[PDB]
Amino acid sequence: GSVIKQGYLEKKSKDHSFFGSEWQKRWCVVSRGLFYYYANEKSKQPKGTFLIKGYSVRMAPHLRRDSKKESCFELTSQDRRTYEFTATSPAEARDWVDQISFLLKDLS
């Protein structure tokens, strides 16, 4: 079907409120051409959706300074906002990068 990969990641998330950005747990889904994410796997509505065409993806240890930096990756665009993620492990992050890359290369 349409889902390529899904699971929990920490997303760097602006609260648009008093505290700014924090790493926050999100259930993330990448389907063909489309990424969407929720607070929880059983949340009623997504927090966000975006078309992935135009994005680049890579591991990104600059995103944090603690020991989870080896599990961080980013989706970047020169036109739209970047999305920054921490997986549970380097292996998990590498898989996200690989699976999203496979989509992005086809889209290109």
Side-chain angles (χ1 to χ4, degrees):
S2 294
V3 176
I4 300 312
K5 182 166 186 75
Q6 66 184 307
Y8 280 120
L9 292 171
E10 301 193 289
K11 180 192 178 277
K12 191 147 129 216
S13 160
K14 297 172 169 170
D15 71 352
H16 297 291
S17 178
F18 318 112
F19 305 104
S21 291
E22 300 293 357
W23 295 105
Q24 312 244 295
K25 175 183 177 164
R26 299 289 181 256
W27 183 261
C28 292
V29 189
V30 69
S31 290
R32 290 189 177 80
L34 182 73
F35 196 103
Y36 55 110
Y37 55 94
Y38 303 81
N40 186 268
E41 194 261 344
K42 297 296 173 62
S43 297
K44 288 186 244 256
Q45 287 197 277
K47 290 296 206 161
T49 74
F50 58 100
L51 299 166
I52 68 176
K53 176 180 170 170
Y55 278 89
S56 289
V57 72
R58 183 156 313 168
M59 296 295 285
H62 84 277
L63 288 174
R64 68 204 286 170
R65 291 123 105 212
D66 68 353
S67 55
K68 297 156 165 101
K69 79 174 107 31
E70 309 80 15
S71 297
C72 290
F73 71 95
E74 63 184 5
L75 275 163
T76 57
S77 164
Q78 291 104 357
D79 21 278
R80 292 139 75 202
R81 79 184 71 176
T82 68
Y83 292 90
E84 297 169 3
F85 297 103
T86 305
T88 68
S89 65
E92 191 191 18
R94 279 191 304 270
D95 192 63
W96 280 96
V97 174
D98 285 350
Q99 249 81 285
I100 294 165
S101 291
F102 190 66
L103 305 175
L104 289 176
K105 277 143 124 220
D106 273 327
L107 275 163
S108 286

